[PDB]
Symmetry: D3
Subunit: 67 residues, 6 copies
Amino acid sequence: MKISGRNKLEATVKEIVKGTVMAKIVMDYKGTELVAAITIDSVADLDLVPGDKVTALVKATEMEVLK
Amino acid sequence: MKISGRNKLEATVKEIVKGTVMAKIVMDYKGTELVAAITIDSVADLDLVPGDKVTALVKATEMEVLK
Amino acid sequence: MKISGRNKLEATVKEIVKGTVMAKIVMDYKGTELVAAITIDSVADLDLVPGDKVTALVKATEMEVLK
Amino acid sequence: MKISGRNKLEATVKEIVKGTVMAKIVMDYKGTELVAAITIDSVADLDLVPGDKVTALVKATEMEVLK
Amino acid sequence: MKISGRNKLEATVKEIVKGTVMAKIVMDYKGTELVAAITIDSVADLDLVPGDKVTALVKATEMEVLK
Amino acid sequence: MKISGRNKLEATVKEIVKGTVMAKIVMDYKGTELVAAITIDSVADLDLVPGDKVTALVKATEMEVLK
């Protein structure tokens, strides 16, 4: 299925820190570090581990611009 | 200042489409196209124009992961 | 691909209103009206039209609870 | 009060998991499971417990469409 | 009902700009200007008029900190 | 740098609660309490502590209006 969220970032998982409800997913994206905060439920469902190839997704309305 | 939003992507503005309230900011990040939807007020305040070097910003809690 | 965003609602598009930058997607979910505001770019990419069966997607961290 | 957030999902709380800062709220919505991640402060303020009839609320700009 | 969204700002509507899909709601909050981007449908549903006393609402997870 | 996020609230940190992944930042804004949920990574990066003068930041598209 196609997804409306416009920003797709093909990245690699570097580190995962699991809390009681949330998880920190640290990724590498063409040399830049990305940090996503998602539920532990999702970490389990996607079965994410360091080294995995993943797509970071961001809705256009959730992206700010700094200049 | 330092910004809590963890995701910073250094990009270049390619195109700007202005609506009555919102604006579409199309950017290039190392060959990947990004799309941000912000207010026209921000386009005016930052004086965004095609070619500008900017930083796309995304809060960690607003980034999903797909696999 | 599996998607971290935890909320998936299988819905049907009822109407689409296109602005210069954003589009209003009015959907029916088992009798409840849903409203998504996405970019016109996504309408074009997904080729969304009235009657389409789609999945409304919401990240867990973007859902409030009222009581 | 009326609320601008367009998506009101009248649901029932099924389970609550409390972390140090965040809390996972699992709900049933017209036969489909929802998962919200809110602050533990809110769980305490709303006195949320299983069986509670609540409204899951999603802003239109925070709802993606997949097809 | 009580609302999980933790940030409530009792403000006054200063200006409303209506687009095809979105509306800009400019508000005053104790001398500080606020700007919300909501759907035009919401302006009509709430029947917002400049001068009206309203509550600006922000989810805790959607608030960044700068220092 | 200028920031597209339109809502800037000059506040003071009152309390910080650190979880495994997220942190609760309790602030005072001209007598009104604010609550932000950001990553513990940001608390460390910004060296946030009670008494700090900070700017709470909210994107226009993430602010709802209630009436």
